[PDB]
Structure formats: structure tokens, C-alpha cells
């Protein structure tokens, strides 16, 4: 599988279990079509979304559920989800890890492209 | 000024200079309707997007062009744009400043919210 | 003003007031020697630290108490302190914004180092 | 082994490989005494640093040498290196993964402590 997503809580220290998640990828009329989805596991992770054949380039959004993820701790928190919106882009052999890390008022998103 | 966006360049520690983002508002039938959008100023800041008056409650997505930042200055980028999405003015005005730490595959959006 | 550290609070999306910090400067014994100490405002910002004149080139390190900022909330998070430790003014005087993101299990320090 | 380091390079979107590190113990009389060191792999980790019968309750200091691995790939950085100063805490069994998300003028720092 060429794409997986890790998401991990920043107020616990903690990997962020049972965060729901979407991905769409983007139709020739400009609007979002659902590709993928699921809950993170344990871990934090997410994995078998999708694969290699299924793949293919385009630009893709994450759309994470972060919101209810924070309501279920009793939390308030500031964003309605986490976005991740990228263009995957055949160089060579790719597999994505996108990383999520949460805090109510913050998130950071980073990607980890390897061969 | 209830709404400022801020914008920083974490390879060169600086301002992110010249940066666009556009404003969206959701309406009532779930699409995203345009509300405000600007540049970032020499401060990598942008000010006066809207007013305590036209900013009512609602659901608000800022979309930062990050991508073309980066291609101007060479870099390919991960990203398409950072998405910030966020409920808004739920219990009365507030004022919010957003936060984009940039770099070429990892970003973090933050929010100060001040009564 | 060449240097001065801002400091928010991830948790509640606010700055974080009242964070104390010391600043030190490698000697050439390789110790640690005092060299500006504060807390932040209202505002999360310590302005003031030093002036252009007392702040040469050297080796610095700031250290935020961010776990007393914590326990003062209720939490007791993972890091015993914030730590930036940074070369300045190598090349000629510049003027140093560290800006430093606080959760309790993680944080990130950004500077903007400005000629 | 209760310690992992991972090291991510937030310039590149890849694990950040040959970063080298050294792990401190405080002693009693507040200095800092080596514990423990090594690399990070092709995939960004550093296994095996101690064993749960060494690694007691403590503060711990991992300084990781950010500016060699920057001063590598030809960029300048800011820090000196990259700092986490932590208390080791025994409440139930626990292992700790310390994650830096590098990029030249910022960097975070993150724990997740997992049973
Ligand atoms: O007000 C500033 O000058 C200033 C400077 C820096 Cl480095 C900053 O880095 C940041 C890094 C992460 C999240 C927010 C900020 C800031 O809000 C910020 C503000
Ligand atoms: O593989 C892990 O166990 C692990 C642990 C932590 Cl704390 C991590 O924090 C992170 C913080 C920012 C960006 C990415 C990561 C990670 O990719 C990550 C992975
Ligand atoms: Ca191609
Ligand atoms: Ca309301
Ligand atoms: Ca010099
Ligand atoms: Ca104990």
C-alpha cells in the first residue's frame, strides 16, 4: 500500500486511536470524489487505504476528523478537521506516510516520501 | 481586525512574504461561498481580511497558496495549499489569529483566540 | 530589542503568560554563564532581554520553564524545559524572534532572524 | 528498549539518516553525564540506546547534532542542535518514542509513551 496515515496526540503523548478519516481525490470538474476511508488503528495508524494500481497521479485530500476525536476527550478544540491536500506525483518507486500531530489549537502535517 | 492570518517560512526564518490565501464561508447549502482573501504583507502578515460585522458565526476554511510560495523560490513542495477549517464566533465575537509554519513537506497551522 | 521570545499555549489557543526563561551564553571555558533572565506577558512575549551593544556574537541558549507553565494548569507534561541553543550576530548584529508552541508532550521552536 | 529516537527531515519529506545524538543522565551535583549514543538509521531511528534495567527514573537531556546534518545537505541552519530534556517516569510499563521533525529554522519535538 503507497499511502498511509499515522496521527498522534500531542496533549496525551499518545498514539490518536479511533480517528476517522476520509480521502478524496479530485475530479475533472474540480470536486472532491470519496476514494478512501477509515479509522486509525491502536497505533495511530491507518493503513491498506489503498493501492499501487489504484493509485494513480492526481491531487488527493485527507480530510481527518480531529474535532470529534477532541469532543470524545471532553476537549474543546479549534478546527473542524485536519486537511491534507498534496499531488501524488510518480518519481521513481513512492510510498506516502502522512503524519497528523494534534493538539486542540494546533496540528502539524508532515509527509514522509520513500523509495 | 477579528481575523489575521500570519505566515513563516521555516527553511529560511523569515516572514513568508507575498503569500495568498482566500477566505471561504459555508452557506446554508454546504458549498463554500467566497468570503475575503489578500496577501501577505513584508510582516509575512495579512490584516483587514473582514469586520466584526460582516464576520458572523459560521463555518470558515482559509485556503494559503502555499504551494506557489514555494515554487517561486524554487522548491516543489508537498502540499497543494494548507487548509485551516474552523467553526467561528459560536459563543459571541471573537478574535483569531491563525498561524502557518511553513516548510516544503510539513506545515503547522496554529489559532490564538482572544475575547 | 535583538532578541525577543514569544511562547503559546497549543492547548488553549492563547499566548502563554507568565512563562519564566534564562538565557545563557557559552564562555570560553565552555560553561554556561548567565546572561538575560524574564517571564512573558499578557501577550506571551519577553522583550527587553538584552541590547545590541551587550549582545555579541556567540554561542546562546534559551531555556523556557515549561514545566512549571503546565503544572500550573493542572497537567504534568514530558519536557522539563524548552531549550533553543543558537549561534548569534556570526555575521554582523541581526535581530532574533524565537517563537516556541507548547503542549504537554510536545513543542516545536521556530526562529525569524531578521538584518 | 524503553528509548527510540526518529528523526524526520522536514526539507526533503524523508527520514533523516546518519544524525548522531548523545543521551545525558543529570547527576546529583546538576551535571550532565553521558548515558548513552549513536546514529540514526536509514530510516530515521536509533534503536537499542538502553536497556529497562539501566534506564531508572531521572532526567535524561538527548542532544541531537541538527546543525552537522544540516551543514551536510549545504543549508544553514539556526540551532546548534536539537534539545529534549525530559523525566523519566515509572507508572505501569512504559516505552518512549521521542520524535524531531527538523527543518533549517524551526524544529518540534514530540513524546509518545506507550504501554
Ligand atoms: O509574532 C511573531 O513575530 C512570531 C514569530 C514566530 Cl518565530 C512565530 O512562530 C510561530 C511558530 C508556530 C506557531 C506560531 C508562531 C507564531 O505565532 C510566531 C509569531
Ligand atoms: O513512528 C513513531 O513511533 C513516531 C513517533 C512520533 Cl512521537 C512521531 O512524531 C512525529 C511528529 C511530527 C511529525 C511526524 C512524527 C512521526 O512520524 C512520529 C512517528
Ligand atoms: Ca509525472
Ligand atoms: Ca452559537
Ligand atoms: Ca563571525
Ligand atoms: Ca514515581
Redesign the interface.
Known sequence: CPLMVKV????????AINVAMHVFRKAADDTWEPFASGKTSESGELHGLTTEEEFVEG?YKVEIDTKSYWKALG?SP????A?????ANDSGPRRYTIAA?L????????????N
Open positions: 498522534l496526540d500531542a496533549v496525551r503523548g499518545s498514539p491531487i476537549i479549534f478546527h473542524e478537521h486537511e491534507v491536500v498534496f499531488t500531530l493538539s486542540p489549537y494546533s496540528y502539524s502535517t508532515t509527509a514522509v516520501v520513500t
